[PDB]
Amino acid sequence: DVSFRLSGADPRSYGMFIKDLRNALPFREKVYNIPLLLPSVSGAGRYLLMHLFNYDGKTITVAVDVTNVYIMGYLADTTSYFFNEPAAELASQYVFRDARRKITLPYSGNYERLQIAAGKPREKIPIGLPALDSAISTLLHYDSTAAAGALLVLIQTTAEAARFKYIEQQIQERAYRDEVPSLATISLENSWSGLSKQIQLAQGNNGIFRTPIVLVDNKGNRVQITNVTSKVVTSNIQLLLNTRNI
């Protein structure tokens, strides 16, 4: 399991937790030296448990699917909460089996659904380590509208930072003050499947992408990634979604 404590957290301990999260995810191959996540894992082994403590030391346990880093559900005291989607319902067979009650959240866990329930697009939600502290405190007290907002923060500060070194650095800069995500951060989040697929397809095509991936850069707009020598591939993306799941 991996754990992160917000009391005394600074950019370095957060960097250590994100390194541990990447290292807990299984892979057999590296494509262009990036870990390629497995196509499927059987049973309970498919789920990684993250223990997160807020500044006051209260905790939630989050279950992550190791083949795609998607958050399935979480445990707060004796209640488990799972997204309303089939994969999270399969995950409930393996994790948090000692929960006294199981609540299914009224939404699935993708960004479109969560932003509708929360009432705000995530360009307008501040993220950082203070925001993660607040997100953990909110999840301890069931409220489905408030939980959608907290889960948008939680997903971006754990799963998205594990997938892209740029987003981990964005959160390290927001260690003591939250700030809404840059447009670059939103584009990267949205492009992980696409980028993962084109890096895999570039093997056997001399490192050239079959279809270019367009991102928006940090200080402006539209840019096209066409091959694996790009900095997004060499220095940024840390994990690849297996094409068998795209």
From Swiss-Prot:
Superkingdom field: Eukaryota
Positions glycosylated per UniProt: 227
GO-annotated molecular function: rRNA N-glycosylase activity; toxin activity
Reactions that this protein is recorded to catalyse: Endohydrolysis of the N-glycosidic bond at one specific adenosine on the 28S rRNA
SUPFAM superfamilies the record matches: Ribosome inactivating proteins (RIP)
UniProt KW Hydrolase keyword: yes
Its EC number(s): 3.2.2.22
Protein name as catalogued: Ribosome-inactivating protein momordin I
Active site residues according to the UniProt entry: 160
GO terms classed as biological process: defense response; negative regulation of translation
InterPro entries per record: Ribosome-inact_prot_sf (IPR036041), Ribosome_inactivat_1/2 (IPR017989), Ribosome_inactivat_prot (IPR001574), Ribosome_inactivat_prot_CS (IPR017988), Ribosome_inactivat_prot_sub1 (IPR016138), Ribosome_inactivat_prot_sub2 (IPR016139)
Presence of the UniProt keyword RNA-binding in the record: no
Source organism (scientific name): Momordica charantia (Bitter gourd)
UniProt keyword annotations, A-Z: Glycoprotein, Hydrolase, Plant defense, Protein synthesis inhibitor, Signal, Toxin
Family: Belongs to the ribosome-inactivating protein family. Type 1 RIP subfamily.
